[PDB]
């Protein structure tokens, strides 16, 4: 099969509006934030603007093909795929996607979507000038899919956090931790899984 | 063939969502920035706002035709376009111009949008003689080197640069970078464009 055939088959079988659950198990989605920059910190009106790569992976067996005599991966526009309905629960602006909206699909049905996103959050900036710095918490999970439908897990990928971060920023990264949580609100009787990402940063000096 | 026929034939056979690789060679993409303006350098935040024409060319032999017209203007939504991104951009590229590319009868495609975009860059010595340098790193967001190769074009002189800017261009250089990691047999490519500039006085 050539790329055209793969893409053609993906359009035939892929249902962008249908969560690809297998035997009524949750779709396991992994999320990892890589911070690229921190812009417009505001010590009054709390608030920070961040740029980050949102590495998002999951599997969708409906996309799979035999790659024995074919390419093993393709880039596909996200409008041809189901993508998880992730939201930052504590965002105060719509995520602005900076990058081409293509996902990478492996022949076994693994999907990677990694947009670069600029987004504003409500976050504790007191202490940004001090040694221990400020910490900004970002909570990310599915907006409409509770824990029987979507599970959300951080990736194992630990302390390499400065590699991705602009060396020209006014700020530096002290630490990033990514912890799993499971929240129930009174609006909604089921639990929603999230990743809480804690970005510990400070002004340089 | 008239322009209508050419455009009609392009829509058959052009696959906007399919990289037009030929016999498992990469699509060779050339990218070159022509700077038009530098707008809001910020010495506090190390950010700069620039306007540039992004000259981008590649080939798709499936589009070729032909004595009768040699080029047409085509809306980019009818074409595959490379998924280039400036890895160190901090704002969405704002396209200022009509989103049309030129397709040549041999299958060459030329796309040159005017783009306004903010980057994180070292502005420290912008008031000095030797000036500041802003590095813009460009490559494919999802495609490695066996699918899309990225090369600078040969021309560097501020022919296009606004005379009304507060800044002047000292020099613009383009270097290709190409890494192979031990994890992975294929190479990763980008083009690094270095804009050396300073405040006029």
């Amino acid at each position: 099969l050539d790329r055209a055939d793969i893409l053609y088959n993906i359009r035939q079988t892929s249902r962008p509006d249908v969560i690809p659950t297998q035997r009524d198990r949750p779709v396991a989605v992994s999320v990892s934030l890589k911070f690229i920059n921190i812009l417009e910190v505001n010590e009054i009106t709390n608030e920070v603007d961040v740029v980050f790569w949102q590495q998002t992976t999951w599997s969708d067996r409906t996309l799979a093909w035999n790659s024995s005599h074919s390419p093993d991966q393709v880039s596909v526009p996200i409008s041809s795929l189901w993508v998880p309905d992730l939201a930052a629960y504590n965002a105060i602006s719509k995520p602005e996607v900076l990058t081409p909206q293509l996902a990478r699909v492996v022949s076994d049905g693994e999907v990677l979507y990694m947009p670069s996103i600029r987004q504003r959050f409500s976050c504790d900036v007191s202490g940004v000038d001090t040694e221990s710095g400020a910490t900004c918490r970002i909570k990310i999970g599915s907006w409409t899919h509770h824990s029987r439908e979507i599970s959300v897990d951080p990736t194992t990928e630990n302390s390499d956090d400065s590699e991705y971060f602009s060396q020209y920023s006014r700020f530096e990264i002290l630490d990033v931790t990514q912890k799993k949580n499971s929240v129930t609100y009174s609006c909604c009787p089921e639990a929603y899984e999230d990743v809480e990402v804690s970005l510990n940063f400070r002004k340089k000096g | 063939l008239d322009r209508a026929d050419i455009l009609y034939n392009i829509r058959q056979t052009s696959r906007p969502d399919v990289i037009p690789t030929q016999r498992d060679r990469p699509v060779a993409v050339s990218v070159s920035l022509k700077f038009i303006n530098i707008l809001e350098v910020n010495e506090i935040t190390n950010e700069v706002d620039v306007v540039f024409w992004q000259q981008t060319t590649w080939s798709d032999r499936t589009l070729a035709w032909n004595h009768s017209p040699d080029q047409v203007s085509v809306p980019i939504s009818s074409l595959w376009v490379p998924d280039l991104a400036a890895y160190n951009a901090i704002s969405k590229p704002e396209v200022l111009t009509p989103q049309l590319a030129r397709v040549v009868s041999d299958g060459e495609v030329l796309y040159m949008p005017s783009i306004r975009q903010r980057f994180s860059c070292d502005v420290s010595g912008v008031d000095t003689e030797s000036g500041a340098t802003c590095r813009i790193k460009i490559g494919s967001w999802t495609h490695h080197s066996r699918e899309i190769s990225v090369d600078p074009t040969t021309e560097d002189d501020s022919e296009y640069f606004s005379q009304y800017s507060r800044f002047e261009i000292l020099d613009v250089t383009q270097k290709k970078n190409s890494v192979t990691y031990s994890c992975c047999p294929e190479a990763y490519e980008d083009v690094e464009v270095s804009l050396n500039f300073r405040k006029k006085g």
Partner: peptide
């Protein structure tokens, strides 16, 4: 890893 490069990271999730 090859984790630093966006394309590589797409092709080899780290």
């Amino acid at each position: 890893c090859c984790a630093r490069n966006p394309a590589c990271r797409h092709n080899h999730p780290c």
